[PDB]
Amino acid sequence: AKSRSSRAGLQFPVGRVHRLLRKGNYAERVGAGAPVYLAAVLEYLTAEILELAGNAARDNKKTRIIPRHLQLAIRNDEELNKLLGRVTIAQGGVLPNIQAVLLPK
Amino acid sequence: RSRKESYSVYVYKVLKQVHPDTGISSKAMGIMNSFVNDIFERIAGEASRLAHYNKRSTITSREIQTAVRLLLPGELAKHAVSEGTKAVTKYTSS
């Protein structure tokens, strides 16, 4: 009756995570607490990125996360930048920055 | 009508939890869905390689933990590990 997602207090689909694990040819026996752990880690990362992007968007007079502020949050946070270093976000552009040498005065 | 499996829902739930009033566009939703799948692939491959190193034929929560330790930069790793351990503990008790 009680879903494993709610049973663990997580929002992500523990069941779907377990299914994907034992179907992606990763191993031969997916533990009972491995799907829960992976779902929790993914949920934490998603919450972090979503909160950062939402706050960056709200700073810009917006009430809807757009790829721009996703990129901004990903690149401003050192941890997320390291995790997503080689990644590129479509319609994300770059961060505002002008080298001191180029600037006048 | 290719019934796939996007994370557009659970992602939206987490968004409402962190920011109840903040919405998300379709492009941002797809970007988040791609990020989720990318992190899933990374962690799963790392846990598989770990299980193969110890000659284990199963990916247990400990393998996922050790894989998360190898990917997230410290504080992020320390928080992800804490969240995963808390989730597994609460699951084992219910």
């Binding site: 919450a47 972090e48 909160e51 950062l52 | 939890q17 962190v18 920011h19 504080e75 992020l76 928080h79």
Partner: peptide
């Protein structure tokens, strides 16, 4: 939740 690492909190 809205409670993460001090840098994000």
């Amino acid at each position: 939740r809205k409670s993460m690492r001090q840098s994000t909190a």
